[PDB]
Every structure is written in C-alpha cells, then in structure tokens.
DNA sequence: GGGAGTAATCCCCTTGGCGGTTAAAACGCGGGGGACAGCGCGTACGTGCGTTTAAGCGGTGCTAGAGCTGTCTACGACCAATTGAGCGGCCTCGGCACCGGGATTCTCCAGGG
DNA sequence: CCCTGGAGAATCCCGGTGCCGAGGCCGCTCAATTGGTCGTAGACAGCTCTAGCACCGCTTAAACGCACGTACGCGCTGTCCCCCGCGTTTTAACCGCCAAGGGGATTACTCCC
C-alpha cells in the first residue's frame, strides 16, 4: 500500500485524501502526503518515551493518564507550544513554597 | 471510519515495545494526530493565501514559521527523508 | 460505653490533632488525587435544572455531562493555584476576596 | 440548583488547590463565578445543539463550546 | 471495620464472623480475599432471585 | 393515571390510617385578612384636620 | 531522559534490595512458629475463652 | 554584544514619566529583560514570516502580520 | 398438503413508593493560629540644579533588494481498479485494584542529664 | 534546655485474590498510485524602481551626578478575630416487592399457494 511505498508506520493515503478533501487552497501540492504524519510520528515518539520512562518510574507497566499528564507537563519546550489544554485525569504535579514548609 | 489504532500500535512498539496501554489514551493520541494536522493546515493555508497560489516546502515552511526549531529540524530533516524515499 | 460493648469503652481517648500538620498532609493526600471528587448526579440534577430555561426536551448524554464535569473540574483548580499564589505573595497566608478578585483582574474577564 | 457544589465539596476543591486555610466569606462569590461560567457554556452547548436541532447534547457539542471559549480541554 | 481487620490477616484470632446480609455487599473485596472452610446462609428467603 | 401497581397502595393507606393520616381536623380559626378599610384613609382626615 | 532512566535505575535498585530485605525477614518468620496446630495446648484456650 | 548597552537614564526617565515613588535599579534591569525578551518574541515570528515570504527586506506587512498572530 | 395475522407465552420489565441501611452535609467551640494596628528607621528616589550630548533636523547621490512584466515548462487536477492497511467480534491471563505486614524514619510526649 | 526511649504510623513493596484487555484470528473491504492528459501557474530572464545607507554637522535636550530630605515597607512590638478538628445529627440513594402490561412470532385456525 503506501505505507511501504513511503516507507513510514503511519498511513499517509487516508491521511492525504483527508487532506484532499480539506481544500485549504487552490494550490494543494501532493508531492508530500507523509509530511504531517512524519512530523506527527515524531512528536508522538517522543512523547511515548517520556510517558514510557515515567509508566516505568512508579513500577507502572500500563500507562495511567496520570503519568501521560506528567510526562506532557515535566519539559519546558512541551508546556511552551501547548499549555492550555486539560487532561482527562488529572493533577498537577507535586510543588511547595518556602514559607509553607520548613 | 480509519484510526490511528494500528499505527499507534507500530509507533508503540517502536518506542516502547514492552509498554501496553489503556482503553482512552488511543482516543487522546488520535486527537492529538489529528487536531495537529488541521491546526498546522490551517496556518499552512492562511499563510499561503497572500502569496498567489493556484507540498513539502509550503508544509515544511509552516512547520517553521511557528512550531520550535528544536521540533522543525527533525521534522524538515524526517520531511526531505519521506520525499526522497517517495521519489525513490 | 454507650451500652454492651467489648468490655469497657472510651478507647478513643482525646487525641486532637492541632492544624497545620494535618493541613499538610490532608494537601499532600488531596495533591495526588487525580479523579472525580464532586458528586456527579447533583451536577446532572443542577445542570439539568438549568439547561430548561433554554428550552425543555433537549436531552443529554453521559458523555456530555462529563465532559462539562471536566471542564469545570479542571478550570477552577487553576484559580485556586492563582489565588493561593497572590495570597502568599502579601502577609495572608488565608484565603481572602482580595486576592481572588486581584487574580480575576490578572487573568482578563473579558 | 444553587448548593449543587456544597461546602465540604468546596472546602476539598480548595484543599486540593493548596491552601493553607480558607475562610468562611470566600465560598460565595466562587461559586457565583462558577455558575457563571456553566451557564455561559450551557447556553453555548444548547446553541450547537441547535447547529442542526438535535434533540440531544452529546461531548461533541460541550468540546465544541469549551474549544471556542478559550479554555480547551483534552483527555478524549 | 478497618481495626477489627486489624488482627484478622495473620493469625487465627477467630473462627466466626458476624457478619449481616448488606454488609458483605460493600465489602466483598476484603471477604473474597480469605478463603473460608464453612458459610452459612441463615434465612435464605433473603435472596431468592 | 394508567398505571396501578401502587392504585392499591391508596387502598391500603385509606383502609388501616382511617384518614387520621390522610387528612386530621384542624383547630379552626377564622380568616385573617389585614388589609383594613382605612388603610389609606387616614392622610385624607388628617390633612383634613 | 538519561536522568529519568537512570532516576529509574536506582529506584529499581532500592526495590530490590527493599525486596531482598523483606523476604528474608519473612523467610525467617516463616520458620520460627509453628504451634497452632497442636491439639493439646487447644484445650486450654478454650477454657481461656471459655 | 550591544544589547547590554541600553542606556539606563532612558529607563530612569520611563519611570519618572510612568510615576511610583521607589524605583531601584532592579526595576530598571528586569524591565529592561522583559523588553528584551518581548522583543526578541515578536522578532522571531517577523523574521520566520520574512523567510516565509521570498523577501529578505523588513515590510510592514510582515509586522502586521505578526502582531495580527499575536493580537 | 403447507405457510401467515390472530390468540397466547415467553421473561423479565416496567411501574412507585416503600422499609432498611450505611455514606455525606450541617451543626457547636477552646483556643489558637491568623490577621491587624503602632512606632521608628533608613535609604533611596523627587527635584533643582551646572554640565556635556546624541537623536533631530534638511538635503543628497545614488543602489540593492523589491515590484514587476512575458512565458513556458515542472507540476497541480485528472478518473479506472485492485489487492492491501486496516477495521470489526472474541477471547484469553496477568497489570492493575485494594487492603494487611512490618522497618525507617516523621513526629510528639515523658523523662535524663 | 539537647538527647534518648517509646509509641502511632506513612511509606514500600510484597503479597493475594479477581478481573477484564491487546491483539490475534477470521471476514472483507475501501481506497493510492499507477496511467495518462488538461491546463496552469510559478520561477527563469528583463526591466526597473525607489526610498535606504550613509553621509554631510550644529543644536537643543537626554545623560547624568549630587545634596536636601523625608515616605513608608518592614524590623520589632502589642492587640486580638474566627479557621479547624472532635463529637452529633439529618438527608440519600440503593437493594429489593409487589403485580399488571410487553412484545415478535409462528404455529391452531382459516384463507392463500
């Protein structure tokens, strides 16, 4: 199909006949159905990783949504391009002033 | 009615093979995928309606324009990795 | 001993805790809550309630409900790390109109 | 329903909001606010509930609302 | 409830729970966890259906 | 009123309360309308006067 | 990420050592009574209980 | 290295304009950071929309632009 | 001889209070953290200073990216069509769910020194 | 007073039992790119264009320091309000109880083949 054609995981033909039928412009070149979904996969990866690292910190071989909310609010860059969205279970994470605690 | 279901299965597999999931968290990634996708579209064609217009460099562009760099070097370098392998 | 009991009673004893230790840990035991803590059929009877003005015969679904439940479950909580944080930025370490008012101010109303 | 929210739901809210103590005239107006709020939202999801008539609100219509509101939510 | 099963896990400290018919509803997760030579069902028109 | 599985329910309650449940005789007292005839009628007789 | 896995790491350490621990305490508690089933000494605590 | 050489009188007089009755030097220097951080914040978006416009001269379609995604 | 509404049966499925409970919400207060009022202080800006000074002000000679045109070719829309990524019942077994077991240290009370 | 014992116990992690969960297996099933053309539009030269760069250099008006000098956030203090936790009390859903309809159909009847 054209997972093997691209050579990339995630199927880009549905990808880019749902981008076909967006019609955000005139000009729609098609000469990169995957480049979404490459940049997608990455971002996605990488998030699986952190969340994979944070499941396997609290010896969690399922991935609670608590630990996706951790793993998406301990980096600086991930808060940055998005901070305004509310998890599904959640519970932000541990935190304590200097004058409420000795 | 085409998921992301199998695909979020490989991209598990690859990251974190040993990991298993939960019943909701493939509804979250899917929206993630998607509501990505349409967001950086819709920058993509409001950034290109100025300029007249009637593909990899106008997706690679908007890439840039506003997501981190630290992101969109490894999206312009996976992006030029997807054409060539297309081409090829 | 209220009546027949095992042997003799009272073992409760006066054990007052004194605040603050307890404030502490009940917050660290609340912190790590990650759920649901409102009842959720008030909320249905109290949107429910006042979803008719609109109009009657408009119907619901569970996920609809709890979606709103989120909504308004995980927006407050901000307000309340945005009034404790003004709170404590002046000498009152209690919770007081003034500063929730300052946070309403900051975080445009409008 | 005015006490949907009563006061030791409230008081647990504020708990797990991290305060040290939380007095007894501060319930009120928060929970004027939050009224507030779910009745602009449920006067939005009742609006695109209308989007084609249907006869029922569904999360569809909530997320659209909260989307357009400013404050987007995730977990679905 | 929790200090009775305080001292109920390691040793034979009992042999018979008085238990009611409504309680074992709520607390099945503690019951079902001990495994019990003898039960019985006193007034079984209690449950019938 | 189509349904009847409690129609009976009445029934019952009628037949062992003999309405002293229903319904108990009051200590009667009259109306207590307060209005009063001259309750605008006495700037008129004072500016009279 | 080094650092969680690593963070990871040493948590796993102190589990297994809190695991190590643990079992020999239990093993030794496992061995050190066995006196409820006797028959003899039964008949005294019923007329305990009793 | 010219971004440290903002003279500190034009900040002092910003504020003697703008009021307060105390205003020390860590004032000066932490607005002065976040001008400069604001800046900087708006620059990047201006120049990634010049790169995204097949110009490499500043227009004001460009600020325009980036002040309209910025509100 | 043989099949379909009508009569009838199935099997809970409704219906609404209706007893009997165990989880929560709304009480009262001794003290007790928590908020608030007074007084000095000290330092550090508000200013009215004499003194340089750096953008303004006015005009210039172009010039280097910009505004801009054919145009013509690399490239965006194009509908057959088929087997493949994948989407859907299903069905198992251990990760998770919840609670007791006991050491370390958290923490407060009764002393020792 | 610091320090030691002495106990409730949070936390750790392990059990210990119950279950439901990702994905494979069977079924099939909808579209992506080949295969090509229609047109088209966006960069290759060509012309140009237009105010920006930097320059000329006084000239007030920012740079810019300093002594009077006092204003009030904060250091302490006293003065003193009502948050918070132990013991009680009043709602609240939920499991059933009870019995008269629920409803597609096919399988006696009788009308169709």
Redesign the interface.
Known sequence: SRSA???????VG??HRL?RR?N????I????????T????????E???????????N?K??????H?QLAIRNDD?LN??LG?????????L??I?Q???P | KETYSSYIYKVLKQTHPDTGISQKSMSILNSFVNDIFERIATEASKLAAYNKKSSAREIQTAVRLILPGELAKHAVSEGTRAVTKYSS | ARKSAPSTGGVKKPHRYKPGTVALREIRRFQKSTELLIRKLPFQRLVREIAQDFKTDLRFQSSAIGALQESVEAYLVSLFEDTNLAAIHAKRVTIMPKEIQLARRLRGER | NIQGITKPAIRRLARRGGVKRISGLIYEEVRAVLKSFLESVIRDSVTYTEHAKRKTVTSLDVVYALKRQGRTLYGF | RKEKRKGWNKPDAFHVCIVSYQLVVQDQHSFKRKRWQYMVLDEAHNIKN | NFMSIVNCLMQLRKVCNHPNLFEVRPILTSFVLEHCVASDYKDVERTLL | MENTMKVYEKLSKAEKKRKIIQERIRKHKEQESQHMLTQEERLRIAKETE
Do not use: W
């Open positions: 054609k691209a050579g990339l995981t995630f199927p549905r990808v981008l967006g955000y412009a005139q000009r070149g098609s000469g990169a159905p995957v480049y979404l490459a940049v997608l996969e990455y971002l996605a990866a998030i699986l990783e952190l969340a994979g690292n944070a499941a396997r910190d010896k071989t399922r991935i609670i949504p608590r996706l860059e940055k391009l305004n969205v509310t998890i599904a279970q959640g519970g932000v541990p935190n002033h004058n409420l605690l």
